[PDB]
């Protein structure tokens, strides 16, 4: 029978009445999806900052954030302590389509984030003079219907991300995506509590009580949280999850996945970091 | 394993005075310090679970600060209801250890 | 709202065994850990152990290994602490509590406390 999540009530998107489940809601999900949704800003703004300075320093924190999630351990655990015990294990990409080596995680936990563009290497990120070129180096010319690599790694549609030179708002959003083979309320609550203790979010009102089961057939700026941030995954492409799992030879044809509520994170960066992150050749380039 | 020590086991103050309790951990505890209040009746109540934060229902006159090994609770203006003992607990390493409480009392004679 | 009623004061002989109880109201013990703490005047609070009533998985401080035994009945929403091989050093106040945040690990709600005295009289 399907897993009983007592505290979070279930919810269904395509048809499946629940008489209390006869209609496609039978087995365990292919995987649970956990989004750590990050909003970041260089809160004290100055003149003389270039458009790139809007996002380079916020993006530089993805590496420490990814390390925190992967090294997080639930002290005083009654069943699961670390992420390795709970996350989805992937082994090898398809034998063809190895061109995405060192851009998608090969061995270990399925964990996606912008840092994958630089192999989760802060030094490689620092030695990069044009973040936009690196980000777009593998997008198609709109000739491929599946989800693009940028969408897969960022977790957002792309216009919400704010990573562009014409960003008028100084708040940039991205996401870290975790695929979990098992559901553990204690561990997930521990991870959520840790992230909101480290990075409290301003009057964050995100919903936290519904798991969505999806079945696939066939001046100074301030960070705000609102209804536009609720269920952000719903604004990804339809083929997003099937294409993500197809890259690893996992099929969602007659089975479903379970998307959990997102964990909010808010990062405020100061001019000292915004400068220390700056690449020397962009100071005299424009 | 981790020994927490409060410098003063007793402290005398007056209504409306600024009060500060402090305690030190034998090693880094990574800001995982909670502050509890015990009344003379004996009932305990959480004040500052996390460094600097506040448990719901606690008056805003309570505050917390500190880092590294040294942490401190502060009462901005001592109220008559704030006569009690205060304990600091570390939740960093698994056997949680409390520090010997510090009592706060009014100035006699 | 949330209350943790404890049993009355207990008097027992040395070498005996006691079973303290702690009944929750306003919440289900399945949803949280239940902890037991020991207060002794002039020595300060100390942590005994905890139980996860959903799993029945217990953990103790190294001081009380082989001393304390924690159990829980979900139907009655009640946790229990059993003390064995009692001695004078066990005369103290025992508090039942929980926590609700699984990274901070703060004890949000407490019982009033149960005084246990061990004397031959
Ligand atoms: C993709 O996965 C499927 C099933 O997981 C593989 O299909 C077969 O799977 C069975 C079960 O392990 C194997 O015994 C067969 O050898 C597989 N062969 C074929 C043609 O599917 C499929 O091989 C996997 N694809 C790759 C490239 O490994």
Distance C97 CA to ligand 1 centre (A): 52
Cα–Cα distance between A60 and A71 in angstroms, integer?
18
Cα–Cα distance between A80 and C52 in angstroms, integer?
13
Cα–Cα distance between A7 and A188 in angstroms, integer?
12
Cα–Cα distance between A44 and A269 in angstroms, integer?
8
Distance, C-alpha A84 to centroid of its chain: 18
Q: Do the chains contact at C105 and B42, CB–CB below 8 Å?
A: no
User: A57: domain range?
Assistant: 9-282
Q: Do the chains contact at B97 and C47, CB–CB below 8 Å?
A: yes
User: C18: domain range?
Assistant: 3-118
Q: Do the chains contact at B94 and A197, CB–CB below 8 Å?
A: no
Residue C15's CATH number: 2.60.40.10
Strands (E), A131-249: 172-180, 210-215
* C50 → chain B, closest CA residue: B95
Q: Per this entry, what is the length of chain B?
A: 109
Q: Is residue A31 part of a domain?
A: yes
Backbone angles phi, psi at A115, to 5 degrees: -60, -20
Q: Is residue A1 part of a domain?
A: no
Q: State which approach was used to obtain the coordinates.
A: cryo-EM
Set of chain C residues whose Cβ sits within 8 Å of the Cβ of B10: none
Q: Do the chains contact at C103 and A193, CB–CB below 8 Å?
A: yes
Cα–Cα distance between C9 and C17 in angstroms, integer?
15
Give the number of domains in chain C.
Answer: 1
Strands (E), A207-276: 210-215, 256-259, 263-269
Domains (range + CATH), chain B = 4-106 (2.60.40.10)
Cα–Cα distance between A73 and A77 in angstroms, integer?
9
B101, B8 Cβ separation under 8 angstroms: no
Residue A94 Cβ < 6 Å to ligand 1: yes
Cα–Cα distance between A186 and A199 in angstroms, integer?
20
Distance, C-alpha A272 to centroid of its chain: 27
Strands (E), A95-153: 108-109, 111-112
3-state SS class at A68 = helix
Identify from C100, C102, C104, C105 which residue to disrupt to test chain A contact, counting A C-beta atoms within 10 A and taking the largest count.
C102
Best probe residue, ligand 1, of A93, A249, A252 (max atoms within 8 Å of C-beta): A249
C59/A contact by beta carbon, under 8 A: yes
Q: Is residue A4 part of a domain?
A: no
Please report, for residues A113, A136, A269, the alpha-carbon distance to residue A53 in angstroms, rounded to integers and kept in the order given.
Answer: 20, 18, 11
Please report, for residues A5, A53, C101, the alpha-carbon distance to residue A284 in angstroms, rounded to integers and kept in the order given.
Answer: 56, 14, 50
Q: Please name every residue paired with A212 in a beta bridge, in sequence order, or none if there are none.
A: A11, A259
Distance of residue B33 Cα from the nearest chain C Cα, in angstroms: 8
Pairing of strands B102-106, B85-90: antiparallel
Give the number of domains in chain A.
Answer: 1
Cα–Cα distance between A59 and A238 in angstroms, integer?
27
Cα–Cα distance between A182 and A81 in angstroms, integer?
13
Among candidate residues B6, C55, B52, the one with its CA nearest the CA of residue A185: C55
Give the resolution value in Å: 3.5
């Amino acid at each position: 029978g399907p897993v009983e999540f007592s505290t979070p009530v279930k919810d269904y998107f395509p048809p499946s009445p629940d008489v209390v489940r006869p209609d496609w809601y039978v087995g365990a999900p292919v995987a649970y999806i956990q989004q750590i949704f990050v909003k970041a800003t260089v809160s004290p703004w100055q003149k003389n900052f270039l458009a790139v300075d809007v996002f380079r320093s916020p993006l530089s924190r993805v590496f420490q954030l990814v390390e925190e999630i992967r090294n997080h351990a639930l002290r005083d655990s009654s069943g699961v302590k670390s992420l390795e015990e709970v996350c989805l294990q992937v082994t090898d990409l398809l034998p063809g389509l190895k061109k995405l080596r060192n851009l998608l995680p090969e061995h270990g936990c399925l964990l996606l984030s912008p840092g994958n563009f630089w192999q989760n290497d802060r030094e490689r990120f620092n030695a990069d003079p044009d973040i936009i070129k690196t980000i777009h180096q593998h997008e198609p010319k709109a000739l491929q219907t599946s989800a693009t690599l940028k969408d897969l790694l960022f977790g957002l549609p792309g216009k919400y991300s704010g990573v562009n030179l014409y960003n008028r708002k100084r708040v940039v959003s991205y996401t870290v995506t975790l695929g979990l083979q098992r559901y553990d309320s204690r561990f997930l609550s521990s991870l959520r509590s840790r992230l909101k203790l480290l990075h409290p979010s301003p009057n964050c009102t995100l919903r936290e009580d519904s798991i969505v089961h999806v079945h696939f057939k066939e001046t100074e700026a301030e960070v705000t949280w609102g209804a536009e941030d609720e269920e952000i995954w719903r604004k990804l492409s339809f083929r997003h999850w099937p294409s993500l799992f197809s890259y690893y030879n996992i099929t969602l044809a007659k089975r479903y996945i379970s998307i959990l509520p997102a964990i909010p994170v808010t990062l405020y960066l100061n001019p000292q970091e915004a400068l220390e992150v700056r690449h020397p050749q962009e100071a005299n380039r424009y | 394993d981790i020994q927490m020590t409060q410098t003063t086991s007793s402290l005398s103050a007056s209504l409306g005075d600024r009060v500060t309790i402090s305690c030190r951990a034998s090693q880094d505890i990574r800001n995982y310090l909670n502050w509890y209040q015990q009344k003379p009746d004996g009932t305990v109540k959480l004040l500052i679970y996390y460094t600097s934060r506040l448990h719901s229902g606690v008056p805003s006159r309570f505050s917390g600060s500190g880092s590294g090994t040294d942490y401190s609770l502060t009462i901005s203006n001592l109220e008559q209801e704030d006569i009690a003992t205060y304990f600091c607990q570390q939740t960093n390493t698994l056997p949680w250890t409390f520090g010997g409480g510090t009592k706060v009392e009014i100035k006699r004679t | 709202e949330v209350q943790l009623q404890q049993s009355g004061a207990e008097l027992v002989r040395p070498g005996a065994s006691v079973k303290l109880s702690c009944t929750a109201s306003g919440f289900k013990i399945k949803d949280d850990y239940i902890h037991w703490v020991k207060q002794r005047p002039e020595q300060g609070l100390e942590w005994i152990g905890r139980i996860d009533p959903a799993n029945g998985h217990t953990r103790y401080a190294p001081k009380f290994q082989d001393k304390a035994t924690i159990t829980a009945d979900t139907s009655s929403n009640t946790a229990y602490l059993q003390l064995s091989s009692l001695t004078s050093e066990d005369t103290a106040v025992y508090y039942c509590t929980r926590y609700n945040d699984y990274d901070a690990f703060y004890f949000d709600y407490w019982g009033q406390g149960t005084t246990l005295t061990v004397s031959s009289a």
